[PDB]
Design a protein around this nucleic acid. Structure first.
Lengths: 90, 16
DNA sequence: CACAGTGATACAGCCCTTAACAAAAACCCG
DNA sequence: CACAGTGATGCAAATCAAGTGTGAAGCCAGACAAAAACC
């Protein structure tokens, strides 16, 4: 049988296709950087997204890594709501 | 072996 | 010299790729 | 029986801080083993 799409694969059944690539990730990041793996697949996906030219999802991944920018101050929502002539119902 | 130096390998999160 | 829009259009600037040279700092030890 | 605002008020409902010590669950290990959609 021919294979199917990689993101349609579940949490389990994508192992026989990435079991090979993971180990040359592991050994390279051990002998080069010092042992980090999440960091060296983080920055590779950053480079893939930026050669892909999708900087918005890159900065959203930066948002999931660092502290979230969810939540504005009530002062800046007040400044927005009164400076763009918004109503309170709108 | 002799140590030949270099700029030390910074951690990949602290590179550009 | 009122001034903060009102939207479409145009263009520019900044950021990826190739691959090879370059200005330059960080330690090693003769 | 026009209908979507217009904002303050006030009541209800939802969340949460906290103790510490539990349960529930995802998942690592490599390997062993059936469903199944094509030739």
């Amino acid at each position: 049988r021919p294979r199917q799409h990689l993101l349609s694969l579940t949490r389990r059944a994508q192992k026989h296709r990435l079991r090979e690539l993971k180990i040359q990730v592991k050994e390279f990041a051990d002998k080069e950087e010092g042992g980090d793996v999440k960091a060296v697949c983080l920055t590779l996906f950053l480079l893939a997204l930026r050669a892909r030219n999708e900087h918005r999802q890159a900065d959203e991944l930066e948002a999931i890594m660092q502290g979230r920018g969810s939540g504005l101050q009530p002062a800046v929502c007040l400044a927005i709501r009164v400076n763009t002539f918004l109503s309170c119902s709108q | 072996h002799i140590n030949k130096g270099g700029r030390p390998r910074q951690h990949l999160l602290s590179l550009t």
